[PDB]
Design a protein that fits this description.
By secondary structure, the chain is of the alpha+beta class. About 20% of the residues lie in helices and about 35% in strands. The chain has a 5-stranded mixed β-barrel. Strand 4 and strand 5 form a beta hairpin. The PDB classes it as translation. Keywords: beta barrel, translation. It forms a monomeric assembly.
Length: about 100
């Protein structure tokens, strides 16, 4: 039984666009905005996140359109599941 976490609340799917260094990445989000996102230390010490990865972004409560935290990074098999379920589109992944 495959199970895949989903964005909740005001969280958004995003594709990592650029590594900015020191736990920061620009992420192209499913609402069509690029957000500058922090990777929390807890996540940094668990996973390797790279350009092109699909992630869940939590927008910050202030400047919500410009900033967020990355809270999850999907594996490739999870990405394929999300595609099949229509949660994201191939056009979105490629950009």
């Amino acid at each position: 039984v495959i199970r895949v976490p989903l964005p909740e609340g005001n969280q958004l799917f995003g594709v990592v666009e650029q590594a900015l260094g020191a736990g920061w990445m620009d992420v192209r989000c499913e609402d069509g905005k690029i957000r500058r996102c922090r990777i929390p230390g807890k996540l940094r010490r668990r996973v390797w996140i790279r350009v092109g990865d699909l992630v869940i972004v939590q927008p910050w409560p202030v400047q919500s359109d410009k900033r967020g935290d990355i809270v999850y990074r999907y594996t490739q098999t999870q990405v394929d599941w999300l595609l099949r379920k229509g949660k994201i589109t191939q056009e979105f992944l490629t950009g």
